UniProtKB/Swiss-Prot annotation, chains A, B, C, D, E, F:
Pathway: Xenobiotic degradation; toluene degradation; Xenobiotic degradation; xylene degradation. Disulfide bonds: none annotated. It holds the Pfam family Tautomerase. The keyword Metal-binding does not apply. InterPro entries: 4-OT, 4-OT-like_dom, Tautomerase/MIF_sf. Its EC number is 5.3.2.6. Keywords: Aromatic hydrocarbons catabolism, Isomerase, Plasmid. Belongs to the 4-oxalocrotonate tautomerase family. GO terms for molecular function: isomerase activity. GO terms for biological process: toluene catabolic process; xylene catabolic process. The lineage of its organism: Bacteria, Pseudomonadati, Pseudomonadota, Gammaproteobacteria, Pseudomonadales. It comes from Pseudomonas putida (Arthrobacter siderocapsulatus). This is 2-hydroxymuconate tautomerase.
Length: 60, 60, 60, 60, 60, 60
């Protein structure tokens, strides 16, 4: 499987490392797929590039 | 709904703010969906990362 | 610009047609970009393929 | 956060339900983010639409 | 590398097979990357789901 | 067609230029589509944002 995760910028390298690990395990375990077949892409969004309800997520 | 918009880098924060607003309204109005259910992601492309017809968009 | 919109399945062709139009206008007007430069992709999600808070959107 | 997962077609509804749950928990726990802020999109690929090394995944 | 290609529905399985091959070779050769490291995803769009300039691609 | 290519950061501008060209030609030739109808987006991933088997690609 291939996962792309969009998260707001601001997290530590460590947190992102954990995220990649935990999500990979969750996917592998969920589908009974080899862990090595799981590929994860993290894409960070600048606070001014994410909107919710037409408002910058940063201010809502 | 969830919208991801790919635009070439170079726009002001303001223009991007407007973009997020107008697009969210257009989506909400178009589908009769609550505005708060609309999430927008803007992804900027470096001029050297967008091609059209095999040529850098920057030079075509 | 290039926009990809993820929406739950269930809308009429007409509504999707409107969505494509309104969103294209909103983008063109927002960035002062030629309308013809706006490309829109609609991607529908089966009700069982969209989760919110770990629950199928269909039941939350 | 917003996650999009690309998986080959063939899994049961149940497996996909589990996937959405486990992945949402993994993301929430990994980033200390409210579970309700996690949105997951599953996108299935037809066996003839996924290539690895230039070969259809189906035959490699 | 990971490539996702959005194309309008209507092509034969064969054409899509070729597409996956040629694109994989082009990527591998372009970056001097092992062919086996190239993964390709083809995503087809229904004619009513692709807009250009606010009009359905089908009618423009 | 519209192609989005995810590659790890580190390549020269030149290599990316070539990539855009070769991939565009491969797509145009593969589908017998006008070269000018091919649009390519390159998205670079920071080494700490790409995971394989739950491990940072950088260290596997």
């Amino acid at each position: 499987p291939i996962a792309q995760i969009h998260i707001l910028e601001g997290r530590s390298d460590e947190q992102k490392e954990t995220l990649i690990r935990e999500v990979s395990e969750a996917i592998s375990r969920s589908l009974d797929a080899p862990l090595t077949s799981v590929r994860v892409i993290i894409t960070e969004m600048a606070k001014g590039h994410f909107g919710i309800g037409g408002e910058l997520a940063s201010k809502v």
